[PDB]
């Protein structure tokens, strides 16, 4: 356990949160996964739907790579404040928050190759403009848009981790 | 739970930790899977208590 402590101290020491991985190099590819816990308030009045998710982001950071410890280092969530994380934001959200009981539902997991997993439990209301002319014989398209606030494709690239299997739990969803 | 790093010896048998020191150590990151919105009461003072036994039991 001690050797892990000096390893983590080595990784965090001399770490600049202001600079992205491969700052001067090619863009960092950020894979994304979602697990849909629930979709609750599909409101026609407010033109929005409420959605709870486990939102995971994967990206390789060579600065955080370590050796000699053959296990995935799941660290306390507060270390997320010390590491660089992507500029991700939901474009069409109206009200979102991280669940914060008993603690902030965050997860930071480092891997020996330098991969960083950053997981968040997010409940967000998202705008869904509905064309209810055919109501109640109507079909709606409700979308969640994910975008980088302050980075372009030459700096950061998004992709769905696992292809079409990136988003899970939709099969288990049922609405009244 | 148990944390051998917080073992101690003294006249007492139980040590009550204030919230500032309670936030300075490791605690389980327990969360409710089916929770929609939860509140940890903070009225008058954070409604939380941490006790450490001499054997290291938290």
């Amino acid at each position, epitope marked *: 356990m001690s050797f892990v402590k000096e390893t983590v101290d080595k990784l965090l020491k001399g770490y600049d949160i202001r600079l992205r991985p491969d700052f001067g190099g090619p863009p960092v590819c950020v894979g994304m996964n979602i697990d849909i816990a629930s979709i609750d308030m599909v409101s026609e009045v407010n033109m929005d739907y409420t959605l709870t998710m486990y939102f995971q982001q994967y990206w390789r950071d060579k600065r955080l790579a370590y050796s000699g410890i053959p296990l995935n280092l799941t660290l306390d969530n507060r270390v997320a404040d010390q590491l660089w994380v992507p500029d991700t934001y939901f474009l069409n959200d109206k009200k979102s928050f991280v669940h914060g009981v008993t603690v902030k539902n965050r997860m930071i997991r480092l891997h020996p190759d330098g991969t960083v997993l950053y997981g968040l439990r997010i409940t967000t209301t998202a705008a869904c403009m509905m064309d209810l002319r055919r109501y109640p014989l109507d079909e709606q398209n409700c979308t969640l848009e994910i975008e980088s606030y302050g980075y372009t494709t030459d700096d950061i690239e998004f992709y769905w981790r696992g292809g079409d299997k990136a988003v899970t739990g939709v*099969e*288990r969803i*049922e609405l009244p | 739970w148990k944390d051998e790093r917080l073992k101690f010896k003294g006249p007492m048998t139980v040590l009550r930790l204030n919230n500032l020191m309670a936030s300075k150590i490791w605690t389980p990151d327990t969360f409710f*899977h*089916n929770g929609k919105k939860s509140v940890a009461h903070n009225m008058t003072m954070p409604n939380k208590l941490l006790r450490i036994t001499e054997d290291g039991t938290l």
Partner: nanobody
Amino acid sequence: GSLRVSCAASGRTFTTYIMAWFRQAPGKEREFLAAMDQGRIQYYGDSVRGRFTISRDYAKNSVDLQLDGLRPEDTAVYYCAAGAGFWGLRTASSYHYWGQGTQVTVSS
């Protein structure tokens, strides 16, 4: 020996229901084996903990039970059950739907 017992449900969508497997050896006692709920949370009996694995296909509305490490005493009739667990989740009375059953035998 290894085996896989599948259960396909028809006539109703069991997305919200707890799908479970029960065992009945000769002598007329029904034993809880495994169960999965809408949250993909797996409950198991003590006798078969770590041996049998329960999974669900919510799109296909089916539940599968993978049996590894079979022994002769596992010879029994296996029942597929579904229903919201009221007063239960380990009691047969809480399940309102049951399968025909499948006989499994093991020889040494």
